Design a protein around this ligand. Structure first.
Ligand SMILES: CC(C)(C)c1ccc(C(=O)Nc2ccc(CCC(=O)O)cc2)cc1
Length: 141
């Protein structure tokens, strides 16, 4: 049964100036996401993604149960965004948290377009979960 499976997640964000600062004077539009690499379907092993926005947002616990795993909002400032990626796994681990640095372009700088690549290593996953990771394009090591 000895077996290690690796899968890849990409977290990222885009930010630029709003032309029309909003009804609460929002200077930026931004978008944060979680995705797989090209030709991988992370929906096979990802139950859901939860984006924990700033406490100042309405309903700041944003849940994507299916792709795209993304939040699009307007704001005035960057903040640290907890992101939880829940797995379709019956044993441990059930999820992984990331602390995402959602930063905006200030002082009329070009738009932000950032990607953070994360490798997840699953040691001795169950038969069922191993199947999901490999279906998603996971690789045995
Ligand atoms: C500077 C600090 C405290 C980290 C921070 C950082 C960021 C923010 C921010 O942009 N909040 C916000 C911005 C837009 C909205 C949208 C409200 C709607 O849909 O009507 C709600 C809240 C607030 C505070």
């Amino acid at each position: 049964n000895q077996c290690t499976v690796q899968v890849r997640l990409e977290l990222g964000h885009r930010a630029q100036l709003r032309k029309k600062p909003t009804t609460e004077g929002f200077t930026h539009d931004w978008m944060v996401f979680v995705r797989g690499p090209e030709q991988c379907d992370i929906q096979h092993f990802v139950e859901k993604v939860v984006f924990w926005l700033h406490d100042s947002f309405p309903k700041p616990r944003r849940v994507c149960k299916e792709p795209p795993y993304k939040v699009e909002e307007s704001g005035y400032a960057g903040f640290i965004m907890p992101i939880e990626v829940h797995f379709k796994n019956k044993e441990e681990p059930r999820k992984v948290c990331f602390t995402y640095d959602l930063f905006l372009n200030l002082e009329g700088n070009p738009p932000v377009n950032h990607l953070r690549c994360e490798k997840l290593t699953f040691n001795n996953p169950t038969t069922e979960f191993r199947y999901k990771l490999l279906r998603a394009g996971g690789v045995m090591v």
